[PDB]
Amino acid sequence: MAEALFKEIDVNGDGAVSYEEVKAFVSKKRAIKNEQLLQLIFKSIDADGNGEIDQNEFAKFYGSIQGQDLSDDKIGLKVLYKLMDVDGDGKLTKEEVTSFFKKHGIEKVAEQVMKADANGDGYITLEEFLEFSL
Ligand SMILES: [Ca+2]
Ligand SMILES: [Ca+2]
Ligand SMILES: [Ca+2]
Ligand SMILES: [Ca+2]
DSSP states (O other): OHHHHHHHHOTTOSSEEEHHHHHHHHHTTOOSSHHHHHHHHHHHHOSSOOSEEEHHHHHHHHHOSSOOSOHHHHHHHHHHHHHHOOSOOSEEEHHHHHHHHTTTTOTHHHHHHHHHOTTSSOEEEHHHHHHHHO
16 A cells, blocks of 8 residues: 555645655654655655655655665564564674574575675664665
8 A cells, every 4th residue: 555655645635745745654654864864865756846746756755766676675674673683782783684594594694794784894783774775
């Protein structure tokens, strides 16, 4: 119900979203400076700059720009990781990620995780983990 959401939020029921409407939409999720973050995204998708977008721009906006595999997998990834992490660190490492994932048997995750982290530090955070997908 992606669209149903876009139209839903649009109490007006016209078939278009705005900066405030979208702000509220995402806001419904969290409040990690969605105002600014969004402002950036919006302006990104918004080529003209009417300050308002439509279901189309909204759909493309939901992802990022021009590329989306499975956002649900992303939100679900953070959700899970958030569920597991009961220590309350907010951050994770390649050893911890591989340690937990290893349970599954997919070590490749360590390879993709190691390649993803082209820093050499050997650690990552939730913010970096999310933005990493973006
Ligand atoms: Ca509207
Ligand atoms: Ca627009
Ligand atoms: Ca942790
Ligand atoms: Ca890192």
